[model samples]
Target: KKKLILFNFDSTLVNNETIDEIAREAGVEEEVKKITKEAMEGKLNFEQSLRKRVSLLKDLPIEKVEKAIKRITPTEGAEETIKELKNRGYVVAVVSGGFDIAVNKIKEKLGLDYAFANRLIVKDGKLTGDVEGEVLKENAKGEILEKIAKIEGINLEDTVAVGDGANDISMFKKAGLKIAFCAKPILKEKADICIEKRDLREILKYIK
Candidate 1:
Protein backbone atom coordinates (compact mmCIF):
# COMPACT_ATOMS: atom_id res chain seq x y z
CA LYS A 1 0.00 0.00 0.00
CA LYS A 2 1.15 3.50 -0.74
CA LYS A 3 1.48 5.93 2.16
CA LEU A 4 0.62 9.62 1.89
CA ILE A 5 1.86 12.70 3.73
CA LEU A 6 0.47 16.23 3.68
CA PHE A 7 2.38 19.29 4.93
CA ASN A 8 1.10 22.77 5.65
CA PHE A 9 3.19 25.40 3.92
CA ASP A 10 3.59 28.63 5.87
CA SER A 11 5.13 27.71 9.19
CA THR A 12 5.47 23.99 8.67
CA LEU A 13 7.59 23.31 5.62
CA VAL A 14 9.01 26.82 5.67
CA ASN A 15 10.10 28.94 8.59
CA ASN A 16 8.75 32.16 7.11
CA GLU A 17 5.21 33.30 6.33
CA THR A 18 4.65 33.76 2.60
CA ILE A 19 2.25 36.70 2.74
CA ASP A 20 4.32 38.55 5.27
CA GLU A 21 7.40 38.02 3.20
CA ILE A 22 5.78 39.44 0.10
CA ALA A 23 3.99 42.18 1.99
CA ARG A 24 7.37 43.48 3.06
CA GLU A 25 7.82 44.77 -0.45
CA ALA A 26 4.53 46.64 -0.14
CA GLY A 27 5.50 48.14 3.24
CA VAL A 28 2.61 46.35 4.92
CA GLU A 29 4.43 43.64 6.75
CA GLU A 30 3.30 44.84 10.17
CA GLU A 31 -0.34 45.05 9.11
CA VAL A 32 -0.22 41.62 7.56
CA LYS A 33 1.58 40.25 10.59
CA LYS A 34 -1.27 41.35 12.86
CA ILE A 35 -3.84 39.68 10.65
CA THR A 36 -1.71 36.57 10.36
CA LYS A 37 -1.50 36.24 14.11
CA GLU A 38 -5.25 36.57 14.57
CA ALA A 39 -5.95 34.17 11.78
CA MET A 40 -3.55 31.58 13.13
CA GLU A 41 -5.02 31.97 16.59
CA GLY A 42 -8.40 30.90 15.18
CA LYS A 43 -9.84 34.24 16.37
CA LEU A 44 -10.52 35.69 12.93
CA ASN A 45 -11.85 33.92 9.87
CA PHE A 46 -8.88 32.82 7.75
CA GLU A 47 -10.39 33.75 4.42
CA GLN A 48 -11.41 37.18 5.62
CA SER A 49 -8.03 37.80 7.22
CA LEU A 50 -6.29 36.66 4.06
CA ARG A 51 -8.36 38.93 1.90
CA LYS A 52 -7.78 41.82 4.27
CA ARG A 53 -4.03 41.33 4.20
CA VAL A 54 -3.86 40.77 0.47
CA SER A 55 -5.79 44.01 -0.05
CA LEU A 56 -3.13 45.80 1.91
CA LEU A 57 -0.64 44.56 -0.65
CA LYS A 58 -2.42 46.20 -3.56
CA ASP A 59 -0.22 47.50 -6.35
CA LEU A 60 2.78 45.50 -5.14
CA PRO A 61 5.02 44.72 -8.09
CA ILE A 62 4.83 41.13 -9.22
CA GLU A 63 8.57 41.13 -9.65
CA LYS A 64 9.06 41.75 -5.95
CA VAL A 65 6.73 38.89 -5.15
CA GLU A 66 8.96 36.55 -7.09
CA LYS A 67 12.02 37.98 -5.42
CA ALA A 68 10.50 37.50 -1.99
CA ILE A 69 9.90 33.83 -2.71
CA LYS A 70 13.50 33.40 -3.74
CA ARG A 71 14.66 35.02 -0.52
CA ILE A 72 12.67 32.67 1.73
CA THR A 73 14.22 29.34 2.72
CA PRO A 74 12.56 26.13 3.76
CA THR A 75 12.47 25.04 7.39
CA GLU A 76 15.46 23.09 8.63
CA GLY A 77 15.67 19.63 7.12
CA ALA A 78 12.65 20.38 4.92
CA GLU A 79 14.43 19.17 1.82
CA GLU A 80 16.01 16.23 3.53
CA THR A 81 12.73 15.05 5.02
CA ILE A 82 10.82 15.32 1.77
CA LYS A 83 13.50 13.44 -0.10
CA GLU A 84 13.55 10.70 2.52
CA LEU A 85 9.77 10.46 2.54
CA LYS A 86 9.66 10.03 -1.24
CA ASN A 87 12.47 7.49 -1.10
CA ARG A 88 10.29 5.43 1.25
CA GLY A 89 7.54 5.34 -1.39
CA TYR A 90 5.32 7.96 0.19
CA VAL A 91 3.44 10.54 -1.84
CA VAL A 92 4.35 13.98 -0.47
CA ALA A 93 2.36 17.15 -0.97
CA VAL A 94 1.87 20.63 0.47
CA VAL A 95 -1.49 22.32 0.97
CA SER A 96 -1.00 25.94 1.87
CA GLY A 97 -3.12 28.95 2.80
CA GLY A 98 -0.36 30.97 1.10
CA PHE A 99 0.05 32.13 -2.47
CA ASP A 100 0.89 29.88 -5.42
CA ILE A 101 3.93 32.00 -6.22
CA ALA A 102 5.76 30.85 -3.11
CA VAL A 103 4.15 27.41 -2.89
CA ASN A 104 5.00 26.48 -6.45
CA LYS A 105 8.57 27.65 -6.00
CA ILE A 106 8.91 25.61 -2.82
CA LYS A 107 7.38 22.62 -4.59
CA GLU A 108 9.86 22.86 -7.42
CA LYS A 109 12.83 23.40 -5.14
CA LEU A 110 11.88 20.47 -2.93
CA GLY A 111 10.66 18.10 -5.66
CA LEU A 112 7.28 17.63 -4.04
CA ASP A 113 4.62 15.57 -5.77
CA TYR A 114 1.86 18.19 -5.44
CA ALA A 115 1.22 21.78 -4.36
CA PHE A 116 -2.08 23.57 -3.82
CA ALA A 117 -2.46 27.22 -2.86
CA ASN A 118 -4.38 30.43 -3.59
CA ARG A 119 -3.32 32.53 -6.54
CA LEU A 120 -2.74 36.25 -6.22
CA ILE A 121 -4.46 38.04 -9.05
CA VAL A 122 -1.82 39.99 -10.89
CA LYS A 123 -2.84 42.56 -13.46
CA ASP A 124 -0.20 43.92 -15.80
CA GLY A 125 2.63 43.08 -13.44
CA LYS A 126 1.08 44.30 -10.18
CA LEU A 127 -1.10 42.74 -7.53
CA THR A 128 -4.85 43.35 -7.84
CA GLY A 129 -5.47 42.82 -4.13
CA ASP A 130 -7.53 39.67 -4.80
CA VAL A 131 -6.99 35.96 -5.16
CA GLU A 132 -7.90 33.79 -8.14
CA GLY A 133 -9.36 30.83 -6.22
CA GLU A 134 -10.36 29.39 -2.90
CA VAL A 135 -8.37 26.24 -2.23
CA LEU A 136 -6.98 26.52 1.30
CA LYS A 137 -9.81 27.92 3.38
CA GLU A 138 -10.51 26.82 6.94
CA ASN A 139 -11.14 23.09 7.27
CA ALA A 140 -10.54 22.87 3.54
CA LYS A 141 -7.14 21.44 4.34
CA GLY A 142 -8.75 18.23 5.52
CA GLU A 143 -11.13 18.17 2.56
CA ILE A 144 -8.28 18.55 0.10
CA LEU A 145 -6.26 15.84 1.81
CA GLU A 146 -9.22 13.47 1.72
CA LYS A 147 -9.65 14.11 -1.98
CA ILE A 148 -5.97 13.54 -2.66
CA ALA A 149 -5.93 10.30 -0.72
CA LYS A 150 -8.95 9.05 -2.66
CA ILE A 151 -7.44 10.04 -5.98
CA GLU A 152 -4.14 8.34 -5.15
CA GLY A 153 -5.89 5.19 -3.86
CA ILE A 154 -4.32 5.62 -0.45
CA ASN A 155 -6.24 4.91 2.74
CA LEU A 156 -6.56 7.52 5.44
CA GLU A 157 -5.08 5.10 7.93
CA ASP A 158 -1.79 5.24 6.06
CA THR A 159 -1.70 9.03 5.91
CA VAL A 160 0.38 11.53 7.85
CA ALA A 161 -0.45 15.20 8.35
CA VAL A 162 2.04 17.77 9.66
CA GLY A 163 1.29 21.38 10.49
CA ASP A 164 1.74 24.18 13.06
CA GLY A 165 -1.40 26.16 13.59
CA ALA A 166 -4.94 26.08 14.96
CA ASN A 167 -6.31 25.70 11.44
CA ASP A 168 -4.46 22.39 11.12
CA ILE A 169 -6.87 20.59 13.45
CA SER A 170 -9.01 19.53 10.56
CA MET A 171 -6.00 17.89 8.96
CA PHE A 172 -5.22 16.18 12.24
CA LYS A 173 -8.64 14.50 12.23
CA LYS A 174 -8.09 13.24 8.70
CA ALA A 175 -4.71 11.59 9.10
CA GLY A 176 -3.53 8.64 11.18
CA LEU A 177 -0.30 10.40 12.16
CA LYS A 178 -0.63 14.03 13.22
CA ILE A 179 2.62 15.92 13.83
CA ALA A 180 2.75 19.40 15.31
CA PHE A 181 6.09 20.84 14.30
CA CYS A 182 6.96 23.60 16.75
CA ALA A 183 3.25 24.30 16.65
CA LYS A 184 0.77 26.46 18.51
CA PRO A 185 -0.57 25.10 21.78
CA ILE A 186 -3.98 24.31 20.31
CA LEU A 187 -2.38 22.16 17.63
CA LYS A 188 0.12 20.42 19.88
CA GLU A 189 -2.72 19.31 22.13
CA LYS A 190 -4.17 17.14 19.36
CA ALA A 191 -0.96 16.00 17.73
CA ASP A 192 0.32 12.44 17.83
CA ILE A 193 3.86 13.82 17.75
CA CYS A 194 4.79 17.28 18.98
CA ILE A 195 8.18 18.53 17.88
CA GLU A 196 9.20 21.47 20.02
CA LYS A 197 12.19 22.27 17.88
CA ARG A 198 12.43 23.52 14.30
CA ASP A 199 13.92 20.48 12.59
CA LEU A 200 11.82 18.71 9.97
CA ARG A 201 14.04 15.61 9.97
CA GLU A 202 12.99 14.87 13.54
CA ILE A 203 9.66 13.66 12.23
CA LEU A 204 11.40 10.70 10.57
CA LYS A 205 11.96 9.12 13.95
CA TYR A 206 8.25 9.10 14.72
CA ILE A 207 7.03 8.14 11.28
CA LYS A 208 8.98 5.02 10.43
Candidate 2:
Protein backbone atom coordinates (compact mmCIF):
# COMPACT_ATOMS: atom_id res chain seq x y z
CA LYS A 1 0.00 0.00 0.00
CA LYS A 2 1.17 3.52 -0.74
CA LYS A 3 1.45 5.34 2.53
CA LEU A 4 2.35 8.74 1.21
CA ILE A 5 0.39 10.60 -1.44
CA LEU A 6 1.43 13.91 -2.97
CA PHE A 7 -1.04 15.99 -4.96
CA ASN A 8 -0.61 18.79 -7.41
CA PHE A 9 -2.78 21.75 -6.45
CA ASP A 10 -3.90 23.31 -9.68
CA SER A 11 -6.31 21.22 -11.74
CA THR A 12 -5.47 18.13 -9.71
CA LEU A 13 -6.88 19.12 -6.32
CA VAL A 14 -8.64 22.28 -7.35
CA ASN A 15 -11.01 22.82 -10.21
CA ASN A 16 -9.59 26.22 -11.03
CA GLU A 17 -6.07 27.38 -11.68
CA THR A 18 -5.34 29.66 -8.75
CA ILE A 19 -2.92 31.88 -10.62
CA ASP A 20 -5.17 32.12 -13.63
CA GLU A 21 -8.04 33.14 -11.40
CA ILE A 22 -5.82 35.83 -9.91
CA ALA A 23 -4.99 37.01 -13.41
CA ARG A 24 -8.68 37.18 -14.19
CA GLU A 25 -9.18 39.39 -11.19
CA ALA A 26 -6.33 41.55 -12.41
CA GLY A 27 -7.92 41.86 -15.88
CA VAL A 28 -5.13 39.92 -17.55
CA GLU A 29 -6.97 36.63 -17.68
CA GLU A 30 -6.82 36.09 -21.44
CA GLU A 31 -3.12 36.71 -21.71
CA VAL A 32 -2.14 34.68 -18.66
CA LYS A 33 -4.43 31.85 -19.69
CA LYS A 34 -2.46 31.36 -22.87
CA ILE A 35 0.80 31.15 -21.01
CA THR A 36 -0.72 28.77 -18.50
CA LYS A 37 -1.91 26.50 -21.29
CA GLU A 38 1.51 26.47 -22.89
CA ALA A 39 3.21 25.68 -19.61
CA MET A 40 0.73 22.99 -18.58
CA GLU A 41 1.00 21.41 -22.01
CA GLY A 42 4.81 21.28 -21.72
CA LYS A 43 5.27 23.67 -24.62
CA LEU A 44 6.92 26.34 -22.43
CA ASN A 45 9.35 26.51 -19.54
CA PHE A 46 7.52 26.48 -16.22
CA GLU A 47 9.65 29.10 -14.47
CA GLN A 48 9.69 31.49 -17.38
CA SER A 49 5.96 31.05 -17.93
CA LEU A 50 5.24 31.77 -14.28
CA ARG A 51 7.44 34.86 -14.40
CA LYS A 52 5.73 36.11 -17.50
CA ARG A 53 2.28 35.61 -16.02
CA VAL A 54 3.20 37.34 -12.76
CA SER A 55 4.81 40.21 -14.62
CA LEU A 56 1.49 40.97 -16.24
CA LEU A 57 -0.05 41.33 -12.81
CA LYS A 58 2.42 43.91 -11.54
CA ASP A 59 0.56 46.61 -9.64
CA LEU A 60 -2.52 44.44 -9.24
CA PRO A 61 -4.06 45.06 -5.86
CA ILE A 62 -3.30 42.49 -3.20
CA GLU A 63 -6.90 42.61 -2.14
CA LYS A 64 -7.91 41.37 -5.54
CA VAL A 65 -5.67 38.37 -5.22
CA GLU A 66 -7.06 37.53 -1.81
CA LYS A 67 -10.60 37.90 -3.02
CA ALA A 68 -9.88 35.66 -5.95
CA ILE A 69 -8.62 33.01 -3.59
CA LYS A 70 -11.80 33.20 -1.59
CA ARG A 71 -13.77 32.38 -4.70
CA ILE A 72 -11.69 29.34 -5.55
CA THR A 73 -13.10 25.87 -4.95
CA PRO A 74 -11.60 22.41 -4.64
CA THR A 75 -12.10 19.80 -7.30
CA GLU A 76 -14.80 17.19 -6.93
CA GLY A 77 -14.15 14.76 -4.09
CA ALA A 78 -10.95 16.56 -3.10
CA GLU A 79 -11.91 17.15 0.51
CA GLU A 80 -13.40 13.69 0.88
CA THR A 81 -10.40 12.00 -0.64
CA ILE A 82 -7.96 13.82 1.60
CA LYS A 83 -10.04 13.05 4.64
CA GLU A 84 -10.35 9.38 3.77
CA LEU A 85 -6.65 9.13 3.05
CA LYS A 86 -5.82 10.55 6.48
CA ASN A 87 -8.29 8.26 8.17
CA ARG A 88 -6.59 5.33 6.45
CA GLY A 89 -3.16 6.28 7.87
CA TYR A 90 -1.82 7.88 4.73
CA VAL A 91 0.29 11.03 4.75
CA VAL A 92 -1.11 13.59 2.36
CA ALA A 93 0.72 16.62 1.02
CA VAL A 94 0.21 19.21 -1.64
CA VAL A 95 3.11 20.38 -3.78
CA SER A 96 1.91 23.07 -6.09
CA GLY A 97 3.51 25.25 -8.74
CA GLY A 98 0.81 27.75 -7.82
CA PHE A 99 1.03 30.24 -4.96
CA ASP A 100 0.93 30.08 -1.18
CA ILE A 101 -2.14 32.27 -0.94
CA ALA A 102 -4.53 29.57 -2.06
CA VAL A 103 -2.53 26.44 -1.34
CA ASN A 104 -2.08 27.42 2.31
CA LYS A 105 -5.80 27.99 2.60
CA ILE A 106 -6.59 24.64 1.05
CA LYS A 107 -4.06 22.93 3.33
CA GLU A 108 -5.90 24.26 6.33
CA LYS A 109 -9.33 23.53 4.92
CA LEU A 110 -8.44 19.97 3.98
CA GLY A 111 -6.16 19.36 6.94
CA LEU A 112 -3.32 18.29 4.71
CA ASP A 113 -0.04 17.47 6.44
CA TYR A 114 2.22 19.56 4.20
CA ALA A 115 1.99 22.30 1.60
CA PHE A 116 4.74 23.73 -0.64
CA ALA A 117 4.20 26.48 -3.17
CA ASN A 118 5.71 29.72 -4.44
CA ARG A 119 5.13 33.06 -2.73
CA LEU A 120 3.96 36.00 -4.74
CA ILE A 121 5.64 39.25 -3.83
CA VAL A 122 3.36 42.08 -2.75
CA LYS A 123 4.41 45.64 -1.99
CA ASP A 124 2.38 48.63 -0.95
CA GLY A 125 -0.78 46.52 -1.24
CA LYS A 126 0.03 45.58 -4.83
CA LEU A 127 2.05 43.04 -6.74
CA THR A 128 5.77 43.70 -7.27
CA GLY A 129 6.03 41.58 -10.41
CA ASP A 130 8.67 39.44 -8.75
CA VAL A 131 8.50 36.10 -6.97
CA GLU A 132 9.91 35.86 -3.44
CA GLY A 133 12.12 32.87 -4.20
CA GLU A 134 12.93 30.22 -6.76
CA VAL A 135 9.83 29.23 -8.66
CA LEU A 136 8.68 25.69 -7.97
CA LYS A 137 9.61 24.58 -11.42
CA GLU A 138 10.03 21.15 -12.93
CA ASN A 139 11.54 18.57 -10.57
CA ALA A 140 10.98 20.82 -7.56
CA LYS A 141 7.83 18.89 -6.69
CA GLY A 142 9.69 15.59 -6.81
CA GLU A 143 12.55 17.03 -4.78
CA ILE A 144 10.18 18.15 -2.07
CA LEU A 145 8.40 14.79 -2.12
CA GLU A 146 11.71 13.03 -1.58
CA LYS A 147 12.53 15.32 1.31
CA ILE A 148 9.18 14.63 2.91
CA ALA A 149 9.66 10.91 2.49
CA LYS A 150 12.99 11.10 4.31
CA ILE A 151 11.50 13.18 7.11
CA GLU A 152 8.71 10.67 7.62
CA GLY A 153 11.07 7.70 7.20
CA ILE A 154 8.82 6.42 4.44
CA ASN A 155 10.28 4.46 1.58
CA LEU A 156 10.02 6.10 -1.80
CA GLU A 157 8.40 2.94 -3.08
CA ASP A 158 5.50 3.56 -0.70
CA THR A 159 4.76 6.95 -2.24
CA VAL A 160 2.01 7.87 -4.67
CA ALA A 161 1.86 11.05 -6.78
CA VAL A 162 -1.20 12.58 -8.47
CA GLY A 163 -1.23 15.44 -10.93
CA ASP A 164 -2.54 16.81 -14.23
CA GLY A 165 0.29 18.80 -15.71
CA ALA A 166 3.74 18.49 -17.22
CA ASN A 167 5.46 20.02 -14.20
CA ASP A 168 4.18 17.10 -12.17
CA ILE A 169 6.19 14.62 -14.24
CA SER A 170 9.06 14.86 -11.80
CA MET A 171 6.93 13.77 -8.86
CA PHE A 172 5.48 10.97 -10.98
CA LYS A 173 8.97 9.72 -11.67
CA LYS A 174 9.75 9.41 -7.96
CA ALA A 175 6.53 7.88 -6.76
CA GLY A 176 5.64 4.17 -6.70
CA LEU A 177 2.18 4.88 -8.12
CA LYS A 178 1.64 7.74 -10.52
CA ILE A 179 -1.95 8.80 -11.13
CA ALA A 180 -2.89 11.18 -13.87
CA PHE A 181 -6.07 12.83 -12.71
CA CYS A 182 -7.81 14.02 -15.82
CA ALA A 183 -4.26 14.87 -16.82
CA LYS A 184 -2.62 16.11 -19.93
CA PRO A 185 -1.38 13.73 -22.57
CA ILE A 186 2.25 14.15 -21.54
CA LEU A 187 1.46 13.16 -17.97
CA LYS A 188 -0.98 10.37 -18.83
CA GLU A 189 1.59 8.83 -21.12
CA LYS A 190 3.85 8.21 -18.11
CA ALA A 191 1.33 7.57 -15.36
CA ASP A 192 0.80 4.14 -13.86
CA ILE A 193 -2.93 4.80 -13.68
CA CYS A 194 -5.14 7.28 -15.47
CA ILE A 195 -8.31 8.62 -13.85
CA GLU A 196 -10.85 10.32 -16.07
CA LYS A 197 -13.50 10.81 -13.44
CA ARG A 198 -13.91 14.25 -11.99
CA ASP A 199 -14.15 12.73 -8.54
CA LEU A 200 -10.88 12.16 -6.72
CA ARG A 201 -12.47 9.50 -4.53
CA GLU A 202 -12.06 7.15 -7.46
CA ILE A 203 -8.38 6.86 -6.56
CA LEU A 204 -9.02 5.18 -3.23
CA LYS A 205 -9.57 1.78 -4.81
CA TYR A 206 -5.87 1.52 -5.61
CA ILE A 207 -4.59 2.51 -2.19
CA LYS A 208 -4.72 -0.69 -0.21
Candidate 3:
Protein backbone atom coordinates (compact mmCIF):
# COMPACT_ATOMS: atom_id res chain seq x y z
CA LYS A 1 0.00 0.00 0.00
CA LYS A 2 1.11 3.55 -0.64
CA LYS A 3 2.05 5.57 2.44
CA LEU A 4 1.96 9.30 2.94
CA ILE A 5 3.60 11.88 5.21
CA LEU A 6 2.52 15.46 5.84
CA PHE A 7 4.59 18.20 7.42
CA ASN A 8 3.62 21.57 8.77
CA PHE A 9 5.68 24.14 6.89
CA ASP A 10 6.69 26.85 9.35
CA SER A 11 9.07 25.90 12.16
CA THR A 12 8.70 22.25 11.21
CA LEU A 13 10.12 21.61 7.73
CA VAL A 14 11.86 24.94 7.83
CA ASN A 15 13.76 26.57 10.68
CA ASN A 16 12.19 29.99 10.01
CA GLU A 17 8.61 31.14 10.14
CA THR A 18 7.39 32.19 6.69
CA ILE A 19 4.95 34.78 7.93
CA ASP A 20 7.58 36.43 10.08
CA GLU A 21 10.04 36.29 7.23
CA ILE A 22 7.68 38.09 4.92
CA ALA A 23 6.65 40.44 7.68
CA ARG A 24 10.25 41.65 7.75
CA GLU A 25 9.73 43.20 4.34
CA ALA A 26 6.52 44.96 5.32
CA GLY A 27 8.27 46.55 8.34
CA VAL A 28 5.52 45.17 10.53
CA GLU A 29 7.29 42.06 11.73
CA GLU A 30 6.88 43.05 15.37
CA GLU A 31 3.14 43.26 15.01
CA VAL A 32 3.07 40.03 13.04
CA LYS A 33 5.12 38.29 15.69
CA LYS A 34 2.87 39.54 18.45
CA ILE A 35 -0.27 38.25 16.78
CA THR A 36 1.25 34.93 15.78
CA LYS A 37 2.64 34.32 19.26
CA GLU A 38 -0.60 35.26 20.93
CA ALA A 39 -2.54 33.17 18.46
CA MET A 40 -0.51 30.13 19.40
CA GLU A 41 -0.41 30.77 23.12
CA GLY A 42 -4.07 31.57 23.50
CA LYS A 43 -5.11 28.73 21.30
CA LEU A 44 -7.88 31.19 20.66
CA ASN A 45 -8.38 31.56 16.88
CA PHE A 46 -5.96 31.02 14.05
CA GLU A 47 -8.00 32.38 11.17
CA GLN A 48 -8.53 35.82 12.61
CA SER A 49 -4.92 36.04 13.72
CA LEU A 50 -3.92 35.20 10.19
CA ARG A 51 -6.02 38.00 8.79
CA LYS A 52 -4.81 40.41 11.43
CA ARG A 53 -1.22 39.82 10.54
CA VAL A 54 -1.78 39.77 6.82
CA SER A 55 -3.49 43.10 6.99
CA LEU A 56 -0.47 44.60 8.70
CA LEU A 57 1.37 43.75 5.53
CA LYS A 58 -1.09 45.75 3.48
CA ASP A 59 0.16 47.43 0.34
CA LEU A 60 3.71 46.08 0.58
CA PRO A 61 5.35 45.55 -2.77
CA ILE A 62 4.95 42.09 -4.25
CA GLU A 63 8.61 42.15 -5.18
CA LYS A 64 9.54 42.64 -1.54
CA VAL A 65 7.26 39.82 -0.47
CA GLU A 66 8.94 37.52 -2.96
CA LYS A 67 12.37 38.56 -1.77
CA ALA A 68 11.47 37.96 1.88
CA ILE A 69 10.22 34.49 1.05
CA LYS A 70 13.46 33.65 -0.71
CA ARG A 71 15.37 34.16 2.55
CA ILE A 72 13.68 31.17 4.14
CA THR A 73 15.85 28.08 4.33
CA PRO A 74 15.12 24.44 5.05
CA THR A 75 15.85 23.13 8.51
CA GLU A 76 18.90 20.97 9.03
CA GLY A 77 18.34 17.47 7.63
CA ALA A 78 15.22 18.51 5.70
CA GLU A 79 16.62 17.99 2.24
CA GLU A 80 18.32 14.70 3.11
CA THR A 81 15.35 13.30 4.98
CA ILE A 82 12.74 14.33 2.41
CA LYS A 83 14.82 13.10 -0.49
CA GLU A 84 15.39 9.79 1.23
CA LEU A 85 11.74 9.31 2.10
CA LYS A 86 10.60 9.99 -1.47
CA ASN A 87 13.08 7.42 -2.72
CA ARG A 88 11.63 4.95 -0.21
CA GLY A 89 8.27 5.17 -1.95
CA TYR A 90 6.45 7.44 0.44
CA VAL A 91 4.50 10.46 -0.74
CA VAL A 92 5.80 13.64 0.94
CA ALA A 93 3.78 16.80 1.19
CA VAL A 94 3.70 20.09 3.08
CA VAL A 95 0.42 21.28 4.61
CA SER A 96 1.06 24.64 6.18
CA GLY A 97 -0.91 27.64 7.37
CA GLY A 98 1.92 29.59 5.74
CA PHE A 99 1.76 31.33 2.38
CA ASP A 100 2.35 29.77 -1.03
CA ILE A 101 5.06 32.28 -1.86
CA ALA A 102 7.16 30.67 0.89
CA VAL A 103 5.84 27.14 0.62
CA ASN A 104 6.27 26.96 -3.15
CA LYS A 105 9.98 27.65 -2.87
CA ILE A 106 10.65 24.67 -0.62
CA LYS A 107 8.17 22.61 -2.60
CA GLU A 108 10.28 23.04 -5.70
CA LYS A 109 13.58 22.50 -3.89
CA LEU A 110 12.48 19.35 -2.11
CA GLY A 111 10.47 18.06 -5.04
CA LEU A 112 7.50 17.54 -2.76
CA ASP A 113 4.56 15.60 -4.15
CA TYR A 114 1.96 18.13 -2.97
CA ALA A 115 1.67 21.42 -1.11
CA PHE A 116 -1.34 23.25 0.36
CA ALA A 117 -1.02 26.80 1.74
CA ASN A 118 -2.71 30.19 1.84
CA ARG A 119 -1.97 32.57 -1.02
CA LEU A 120 -1.46 36.29 -0.74
CA ILE A 121 -3.24 38.32 -3.39
CA VAL A 122 -1.14 40.79 -5.32
CA LYS A 123 -2.66 43.78 -7.09
CA ASP A 124 -0.85 46.54 -8.92
CA GLY A 125 2.62 45.30 -7.85
CA LYS A 126 1.61 45.28 -4.18
CA LEU A 127 -0.12 43.09 -1.64
CA THR A 128 -3.85 43.28 -1.10
CA GLY A 129 -3.09 41.98 2.43
CA ASP A 130 -5.69 39.36 1.64
CA VAL A 131 -5.26 35.63 1.95
CA GLU A 132 -7.18 32.76 0.42
CA GLY A 133 -6.95 28.99 0.45
CA GLU A 134 -6.83 26.13 2.95
CA VAL A 135 -6.17 28.33 5.97
CA LEU A 136 -9.50 30.11 5.74
CA LYS A 137 -10.79 28.03 8.66
CA GLU A 138 -9.34 27.46 12.09
CA ASN A 139 -8.13 23.90 12.74
CA ALA A 140 -8.09 23.42 8.98
CA LYS A 141 -4.77 21.59 9.07
CA GLY A 142 -6.28 18.24 10.03
CA GLU A 143 -9.16 18.64 7.60
CA ILE A 144 -6.79 19.30 4.72
CA LEU A 145 -4.62 16.31 5.61
CA GLU A 146 -7.62 14.01 5.71
CA LYS A 147 -8.62 15.15 2.27
CA ILE A 148 -5.09 14.84 0.90
CA ALA A 149 -4.82 11.28 2.14
CA LYS A 150 -8.06 10.42 0.41
CA ILE A 151 -6.81 11.99 -2.79
CA GLU A 152 -3.67 9.88 -2.61
CA GLY A 153 -5.79 6.77 -2.08
CA ILE A 154 -3.93 6.22 1.15
CA ASN A 155 -5.75 5.21 4.29
CA LEU A 156 -5.54 7.36 7.40
CA GLU A 157 -3.54 4.72 9.23
CA ASP A 158 -0.96 4.73 6.47
CA THR A 159 -0.14 8.35 7.15
CA VAL A 160 2.27 10.25 9.38
CA ALA A 161 1.71 13.83 10.53
CA VAL A 162 4.50 16.09 11.77
CA GLY A 163 4.37 19.60 13.18
CA ASP A 164 5.53 21.94 15.94
CA GLY A 165 2.71 23.98 17.40
CA ALA A 166 -0.45 23.92 19.48
CA ASN A 167 -2.57 24.10 16.34
CA ASP A 168 -1.07 20.84 15.15
CA ILE A 169 -2.96 18.77 17.73
CA SER A 170 -5.96 18.41 15.45
CA MET A 171 -3.72 16.97 12.76
CA PHE A 172 -2.15 14.61 15.30
CA LYS A 173 -5.43 12.77 15.63
CA LYS A 174 -5.41 12.04 11.89
CA ALA A 175 -2.16 10.15 11.48
CA GLY A 176 -0.84 6.74 12.45
CA LEU A 177 2.37 8.37 13.68
CA LYS A 178 2.41 11.88 15.07
CA ILE A 179 5.77 13.56 15.47
CA ALA A 180 6.33 16.80 17.32
CA PHE A 181 9.56 18.18 16.05
CA CYS A 182 11.21 20.59 18.46
CA ALA A 183 7.65 21.42 19.27
CA LYS A 184 5.69 23.41 21.77
CA PRO A 185 4.89 21.69 25.07
CA ILE A 186 1.22 21.32 24.26
CA LEU A 187 2.02 19.47 21.07
CA LYS A 188 4.72 17.31 22.66
CA GLU A 189 2.20 16.02 25.16
CA LYS A 190 0.02 14.71 22.37
CA ALA A 191 2.58 13.43 19.90
CA ASP A 192 3.51 9.78 19.69
CA ILE A 193 7.12 10.76 19.09
CA CYS A 194 8.83 13.94 20.20
CA ILE A 195 12.15 15.02 18.86
CA GLU A 196 13.41 17.83 21.04
CA LYS A 197 16.27 18.71 18.77
CA ARG A 198 16.29 20.54 15.46
CA ASP A 199 17.44 17.65 13.34
CA LEU A 200 14.97 16.21 10.83
CA ARG A 201 17.04 13.13 10.01
CA GLU A 202 16.12 11.57 13.34
CA ILE A 203 12.61 11.11 12.05
CA LEU A 204 13.83 8.59 9.50
CA LYS A 205 14.65 6.05 12.19
CA TYR A 206 11.13 6.19 13.56
CA ILE A 207 9.49 5.66 10.15
CA LYS A 208 9.24 2.57 7.98
> Best lDDT goes to which candidate?
2
Error of 3 at 59 (Å): 0.7
- Candidate 2: list runs displaced more than 4 Å: none
Worst ten in a row by lDDT for model 1: 131-140
- Determine which window of 10 residues in candidate 2 has minimal summed lDDT: 130-139
Residue-level lDDT tens digits of model 3 in 66-93: 7887788789999999988987879999
How do the residues 1-208 of candidate 2 rate in per-residue lDDT, one tens digit apiece?
A: 3389999999888899988999999899999998998898889989889989999989989889988998888889998899889888889999988898889999998999999999899889999987754335677888999999998989998999999998999999899899999988999999999999999999999974
CA-only RMSD, every prediction = 1.2, 1.3, 1.3
The per-residue C-alpha lDDT of model 2 at residue 152 equals 91
**Candidate 1 structure lDDT:** 0.88
Best by TM-score: 2
Q: What TM-score would each prediction reach against the true structure?
A: 0.96, 0.96, 0.95
User: Candidates sorted by TM-score, descending order?
Assistant: 2, 1, 3
Q: Give a tens-digit lDDT track for model 1, residues 1-118.
A: 8999999999889889999889888898988998898788777887888889999988989898988888788899998999899988899999888888888988888999888888
Off by over 4 Å in 3: none
Better of 2 and 3 by lDDT: 2
Off by over 4 Å in 1: none
